[PDB]
Amino acid sequence: NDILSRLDPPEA
Amino acid sequence: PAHFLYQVKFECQFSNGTERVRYLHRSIYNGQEDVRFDSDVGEFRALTELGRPRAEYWNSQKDYLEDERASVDTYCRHNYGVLDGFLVHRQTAPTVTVFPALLVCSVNGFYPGPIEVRWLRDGREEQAGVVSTGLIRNGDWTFQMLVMLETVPRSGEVYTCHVQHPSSSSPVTVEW
Amino acid sequence: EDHVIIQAEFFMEPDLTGEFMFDFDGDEIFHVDMQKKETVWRLEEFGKFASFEAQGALANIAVDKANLETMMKRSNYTPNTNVPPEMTVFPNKAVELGEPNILICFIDKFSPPVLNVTWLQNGKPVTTGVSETVFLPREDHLFRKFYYLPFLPSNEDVYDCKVEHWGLEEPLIKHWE
């Protein structure tokens, strides 16, 4: 049972 | 030498279990929040001019608005269910002693923070005289609190430290 | 609100330092150690009841660096303001002569997240068994950090926690005995 992370939109 | 700092924060605020869930996405350059998603608003907001370009990208990114809007479910409510299985309701009973420094009630090793610490004297609780450090975070998932009672050293009388903490329906008491 | 989960990341230049952590009501759940590429639970027991894929964190930090460099250029290279710490030195438990204990040096309300923290015993630097947390987040986007020093309480020992930070002109030193 997994803690999920979110990603800050990458600016490349 | 100059420094440059970028902070990202994803916050989930919970009230009444998971009836009230608020997701926040914070983009923070040099300690200032430039752009935010707030699920109560349901749109991105440029808090500073520096965030407008970064808000345009977010708002123009393919399915991103819907993904932010669904995060109260896919991220917040998800992570809460994991944490409810051990973290949300963790309780550690406090450790209580009395010792001369003025009389000192040491309340150690307790979680969560909310606690009721009372000084009694021959059965009656006094209000004036009592000095508290307040809640001191230990950083290892425990708190402590020293509650002192400026007290006239007169033989005959018993001082009790009365500690009510959710961890027990019943209080933890230390006479002197 | 009753409870708060915070996922907090940073990358910093020119230091090239980044951290990734989760926070529950102001205590660390876990971080990802960037050297070891590993989820480190704040208490080991937590890892029985939850899992986290370390590689995701590392990817976020690579992306945070990139996002930093874009904001540096967009800000016309405006630097971060140095905000100096405040410090408290206190024992973990009620102290009793010759029963092992832990001295806590708590450092609060500082930016950026870089500290040089030195423990002294009777004027001399000590390191045996020292531990520290990650850079803990604050609502105001400054940082907190705990440093731990195992000690055997005595009558005659004096301890100093010494902190260096770019926000201070001279070191901030407090003591306990």
Please classify residue B57 by burial: count the beta carbons closer than 10 Å to its beta carbon, then call 0-12 exposed, 13-18 middle and 19+ buried: middle
- The experimental technique behind this entry is X-ray
Q: Is B111 on the interface with A (CB under 8 A)?
A: no
| Distance between CA atoms of residues B111 and B94, nearest Å | 8
Shared domain check, B99 and B80 = no
Distances from the Cα of B161 to the Cαs of B107, B122, B135, B176, in angstroms? 10, 11, 17, 9
Please report which residue ranges of chain B form alpha helices under DSSP H. Answer: 52-60, 64-69, 71, 78-84
**Residue B77: alpha-carbon gap to chain centroid:** 19
Contacts with C9 from chain A: Cβ below 8 Å:
8
Residue B168's CATH number: 2.60.40.10
**Strand ranges in chain C using DSSP code E only, listed in sequence order:** 3-13, 17-24, 27-33, 38-41, 86-91, 101-110, 116-121, 124-126, 131-132, 136-137, 143-151, 159-164, 172-176
Contacts with A1 from chain C: Cβ below 8 Å:
49-51
Tell me, what amino acid is at B58?
W
Residue B52's CATH number: 3.10.320.10
Please classify residue C47 by burial: count the beta carbons closer than 10 Å to its beta carbon, then call 0-12 exposed, 13-18 middle and 19+ buried: middle
Cβ-based neighbour number of residue B26 at 10 Å: 21
Distances from the Cα of C95 to the Cαs of B99, B173, C87, C173, in angstroms? 11, 20, 20, 22
Q: Nearest-CA distance from C60 to chain A in Å?
A: 6
Residues C85, C117: contact at Cβ < 8 Å?
Answer: no
Chains in contact with A, where contact means 3 or more Cβ–Cβ distances below 8 Å, are: B, C
B89 part of a folded domain: no
Determine the structural domain holding residue B14 and report its residue range: 6-84
Of B58, B75, B83, the CB nearest to A6: B75
Lookup: tokens for B159? 């001082």
Distances from the Cα of C60 to the Cαs of A7, B64, B92, C17, C25, in angstroms? 6, 17, 34, 13, 23
Of C13, C93, C146, the CB nearest to B139: C146
**Record: fold of C5-74:** 3.10.320
| Distance between CA atoms of residues C10 and C79, nearest Å | 15
Q: Which of C96, C97, C147, C86 is nearest to C120 (CA)?
A: C147
| Distance between CA atoms of residues C106 and C104, nearest Å | 6
Of C9, C26, C81, the CB nearest to B30: C81
Q: Which of C67, C36, C108, C12 is nearest to B34 (CA)?
A: C67
Secondary structure element (H or E) that encloses residue B118, with its range: strand B116-121
**Record: fold of C86-176:** Immunoglobulin-like (2.60.40)
